[PDB]
């Protein structure tokens, strides 16, 4: 049996590492494991009955140093309302806006949101929107194990309350939020150190009900191909 299929079984929960940045400064980090996904809110007030795990972004500061911009940050957090919903349905991650803050997203690197390609689009409000497809990710991951392509991107960056910072430093934006499906961080890491020969390495898939995985490089590449053949493609 393929242990990597555990990611795509219904009822299983991925871990989402949420990291928030106010003006190029990390202010918040929390890991969420919820079946109905997460929900980036700013605590006003609110509808407690809304599905998804509430992730409250912290209030900024009331400092004489940095207040001409922290009032703007607090202004954005006051308009998140229902917040930014992010959940998983099968092999897709879905994001939707429930508040009044226009939000732009992109699947980029972990230490840098804006590479140059621009945003992958804006988080929709009236409909749910696909932000990540596991299909193309595994395919690119196999090619990465096959010493050819580059490392596939898995980090979801969100630019809240402002337009996407293209050709501008991302430290200028008021509210930036990085969300990482920690299973994908592991899969990439497993392919980063594991590709030494046919030895064993250990990968924690970081998902609900799962044990560590001691696999060989060939075994890992075999499971990945078997994972692909059992997924929808476009």
């Amino acid at each position: 049996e393929n242990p990597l299929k555990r990611l795509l079984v219904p009822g299983e929960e991925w871990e989402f590492e949420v990291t928030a940045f106010y003006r190029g400064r990390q202010v918040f980090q929390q890991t969420i494991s919820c079946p109905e996904g997460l929900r980036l809110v700013g605590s006003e007030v609110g509808d407690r009955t809304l599905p998804g795990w509430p992730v409250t972004l912290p209030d900024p500061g009331m400092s004489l140093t940095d207040r001409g911009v922290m009032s703007y940050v607090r202004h954005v957090l006051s308009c998140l309302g229902g917040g930014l919903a992010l959940w998983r349905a099968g092999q897709w991650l879905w994001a939707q806006r429930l508040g009044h803050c226009h939000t732009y997203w992109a699947v980029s690197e972990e230490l840098l949101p804006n590479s140059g390609h621009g945003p992958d689009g804006e988080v929709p409000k009236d409909k749910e929107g696909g932000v990540f497809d596991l299909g193309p990710f595994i395919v690119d991951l196999i090619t990465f194990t096959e010493g050819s392509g580059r490392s596939p991107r898995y980090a979801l960056w969100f630019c809240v309350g402002e337009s996407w910072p293209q050709d501008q430093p991302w430290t200028k934006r008021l509210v930036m939020v990085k969300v990482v499906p920690t299973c994908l961080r592991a899969l990439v890491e497993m392919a980063r150190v594991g590709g030494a020969s046919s030895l064993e390495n250990t990968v924690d898939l970081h998902i609900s009900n799962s044990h560590p995985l001691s696999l060989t490089s060939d075994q890992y590449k075999a499971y990945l191909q078997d994972l692909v053949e059992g997924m929808d493609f476009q």
Binding site: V69, Y72, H75, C79, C101, E162, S163
Partner: peptide, 10 residues
């Protein structure tokens, strides 16, 4: 440093 808040109300 000016800020255009894409906050859509009403």
């Amino acid at each position: 440093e000016e800020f255009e808040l894409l906050i859509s109300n009403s």
